[PDB]
């Protein structure tokens, strides 16, 4: 089928960019500067416009020196290599990358839309059809990523954006990692952690599917399946695998979720013989047109609503290590 075609052509396109990262592409003098929405509690993200084309992009300001501290400096040098090598419709884009004494500036695409977390929390919960709509997009995105042996590891409403077309756009590859075999960092979000992560048994693609189960549950319920006031209790619930579904959850949904939230890896959807098709062919996704969702031809159920002046050092610093970029 074309699925194989697409993925094959996909791996090709990816391995090429992966084994030859596109370093320092565009020049900072081609982009101006507008607002400056990028504070929070880390990093400096400011809006910006383009010259000739005159487009809008989101530039992440990462002071070459600012690094070295914090928690890590590879979970980034690696993050950059991935964003640049990947290409999918429901994935944010690394448009332009560059550095020099400033060093390591990320020119991400910009969608003047709304956050998934804000939307979900306001209305409480999505109808199953609407939830299925967003879910399909994440299934497809994970199939693509896993095709490239890349695991996301941080699925959650907070990391999902709703673009002006009403489709999902995934952001923040802080924990994204290419792994063929097994990996071990205990990372992600409490509510969304897999039993194997919590217990350090080693893991790979299966955690993303577990997270999806959590993500789908929360969308249709309004709250995550293993919620609790204390982190410890959340994990003990996660490890026990016992889940209680709201009254309004349909049968097909409950079944799909029992298969995604499987503590037993021999029974978890996505991890079995057929992989992602066990999910794509599930009765809950029967009314889903996978190609349609991919081409973004389906009508989304919700269209969202729509400082300072830093300078270089006139000299390149930490460039004696951030070479690869």
């Amino acid at each position: 089928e074309s699925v194989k075609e697409f993925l094959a052509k996909a791996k090709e396109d990816f391995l090429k960019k992966w084994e030859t990262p596109s370093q320092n592409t565009a020049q900072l003098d081609q982009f101006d500067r507008i607002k400056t929405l990028g504070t929070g509690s880390f990093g400096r993200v400011m809006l910006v416009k383009h010259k000739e084309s005159g487009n809008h992009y989101a530039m992440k300001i990462l002071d070459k020196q600012k690094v070295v501290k914090l928690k890590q400096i590879e979970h980034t040098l690696n993050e950059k290599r991935i964003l640049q090598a990947v290409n999918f419709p429901f994935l944010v884009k690394l448009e332009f990358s560059f550095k020099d004494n400033s060093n390591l500036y990320m020119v991400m695409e910009y969608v003047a839309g709304g956050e998934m977390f804000s939307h979900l929390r306001r209305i409480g919960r999505f109808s199953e059809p609407h939830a299925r709509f967003y879910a399909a997009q994440i299934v497809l995105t994970f199939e693509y990523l896993h095709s490239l042996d890349l695991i996301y590891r941080d699925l959650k409403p907070e990391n999902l954006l709703i673009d002006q077309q009403g489709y999902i756009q995934v952001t923040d590859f802080g924990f994204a990692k290419r792994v063929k075999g097994r990996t071990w960092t205990l990372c992600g979000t409490p509510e969304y952690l897999a039993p194997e992560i919590i217990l350090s048994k080693g893991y790979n693609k299966a955690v993303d599917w577990w997270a999806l189960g959590v993500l789908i549950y929360e969308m249709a319920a309004g709250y995550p399946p293993f919620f609790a006031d204390q982190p410890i209790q959340i994990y003990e619930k996660i490890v026990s695998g016992k889940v209680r579904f709201p009254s309004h959850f349909s049968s097909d949904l409950k079944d799909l979720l029992r298969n995604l939230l499987q503590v037993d890896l021999t029974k978890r959807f996505g991890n079995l013989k057929n992989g992602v098709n066990d999910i794509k062919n599930h009765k809950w996704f029967a009314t889903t047109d996978w190609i349609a969702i991919y081409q973004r031809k389906v009508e989304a159920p919700f269209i969202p609503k729509f400082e300072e002046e830093i300078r270089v050092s006139i000299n390149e610093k930490c460039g004696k290590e951030f070479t690869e970029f």
């Binding site: 928690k71 890590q72 590879e74 979970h75 977390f117 941080d154 959650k156 907070e158 802080g174 924990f175 063929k180 075999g181 097994r182 990996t183 071990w184 960092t185 205990l186 990372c187 992600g188 979000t189 409490p190 509510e191 194997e196 919590i198 217990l199 350090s200 048994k201 080693g202 790979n204 204390q230 982190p231 410890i232 994990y235 003990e236 490890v239 037993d264 890896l265 021999t266 029974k267 991890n271 079995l272 013989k273």
Partner: protein
């Protein structure tokens, strides 16, 4: 409220190259084990890892009036009480409540073993006491290292099994993820002739004797005793037929000395990799060979 991500310190799982000594009496260690039974991170750890972990636990002496942990402070260790009394306090908004006490028993701060996060309560000693402590980094490294070593070892025993040679790397790892281990003392029965064949074994140590009571050979009667058909050793496997058929076990299997086997459920195996017959055919130039091995003479 937006939930923030958490992350522990990274570490090269694959053993760098052999390169924590805190004395403990039998009673002390035995008491530490008891205190740890229910802690989820410890709850289902194997014998070895638990030992290495207790080995790594350092002692911390505390004088009365001293703060073991203070609410809000960053956490790095988990503590088990050895001696002493302690008062537990929890501040909610502007109020601080002396909520509970510990009297020479207890543990707290388990969360610190996962990632760095603020201490949720304050613990103060009310007498001279002693606590056993464990640093996150030390704890995570002991565990990951050991599980990554176990994985490599499981991987090898699956890889050397010819029946699984056509398996891809990722397919062997799915097995490694779920496969079990069992220890058998010399002479104890592992497989009983007649019961249902649900799994297969791969000997990783010791030997196994396969016996058959020669009666199921005719029409009613005979031998009705004990005959050894085969005798397997380290690296070999038995019970393979459960992977390709659904008839009661043909013969019984007993441990010849101390034995350690990897045990894999057939149904789980199929759900993960599909039926074994297809795997055997994957490499067509060895299909016949494989067939003769499974249903052949010897």
């Amino acid at each position: 409220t937006r939930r923030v991500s958490v992350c522990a310190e990274t570490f090269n799982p694959d053993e760098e190259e052999e390169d924590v000594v805190h004395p403990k009496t039998d009673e002390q260690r035995c008491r530490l084990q008891e205190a740890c039974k229910d802690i989820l991170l410890f709850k289902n750890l194997d014998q070895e890892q638990l030992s290495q972990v207790l080995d790594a636990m350092f002692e911390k002496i505390v004088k009365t009036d001293e703060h073991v942990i203070d609410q809000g402070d960053d956490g790095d260790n988990f503590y088990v009480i050895e001696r002493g009394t302690y008062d537990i306090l929890v501040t909610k908004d502007n109020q601080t409540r002396s909520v509970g006490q510990y009297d020479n028993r207890g543990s707290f701060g388990e969360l610190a073993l996962m990632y760095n996060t603020p201490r949720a309560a304050t613990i103060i000693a009310t007498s001279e006491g002693s606590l056993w402590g464990l640093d996150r980094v030390t704890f995570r490294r002991i565990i990951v290292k050991n599980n990554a070593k176990k994985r490599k070892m499981f991987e090898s025993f699956i890889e050397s099994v010819p029946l699984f040679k056509s398996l891809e790397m990722s397919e062997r790892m799915k097995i490694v993820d779920v496969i079990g281990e069992k220890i058998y003392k010399d002479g104890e029965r592992i497989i009983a002739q007649g019961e249902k064949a649900d799994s297969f074994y791969i000997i990783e140590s010791g030997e196994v004797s396969i016996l058959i009571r020669s009666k199921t050979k005719s029409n009613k009667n005979g031998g009705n005793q004990e005959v050894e058909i085969a005798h397997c050793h380290k690296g070999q496997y038995f019970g393979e037929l459960a992977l390709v058929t659904n008839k009661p076990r043909a013969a019984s299997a007993y441990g010849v000395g101390d034995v350690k086997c990897l045990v894999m459920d057939v149904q789980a195996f199929e759900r993960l990799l599909g039926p074994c017959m297809d795997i055997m055919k994957r490499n067509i130039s060895h299909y016949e060979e494989q067939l003769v091995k499974m249903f052949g003479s010897n």
